[PDB]
Amino acid sequence: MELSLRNVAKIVEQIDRAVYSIDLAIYTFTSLFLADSIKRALQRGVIIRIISDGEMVYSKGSQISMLAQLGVPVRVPITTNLMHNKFCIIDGFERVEEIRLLRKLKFMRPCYSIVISGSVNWTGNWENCIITADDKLTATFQAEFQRMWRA
Ligand SMILES: [Cl-]
Fold this sequence. Notes:
One of its GO terms (molecular function) is RNA endonuclease activity, producing 5'-phosphomonoesters. This protein has 151 residues and is α/β, with parallel strands linked by helices.
């Protein structure tokens, strides 16, 4: 239970350093530490999207409603949302590039894609956490995120 504290700390820190975008796919979202980092990211101008489960979104105590009220778009598949892992994409290449077109930015702040992944908890735990900056893995996660976002 100590590694989960260390891992969450590293994840919050990664979210704090998000420049343009955060795409999060999670089964249950109860971590106050994660939810607050998303808050600070949103206040920092970062565009954030969240994909979760319809039933778990209204469970106790979910942080989804608190984030959705701040203007964070949340989409849930129906039904239900079964995943093999929860993941977070920070400044994914394709996602940042599409933001470039949306805001029509003349200049780009330097950044790079970071993928955080871990085991799904069905019942604030981040077990089997991996943090890496490989675009090969990034593009795959982004593609999966794009798919669920459509549906
Ligand atoms: Cl989860």
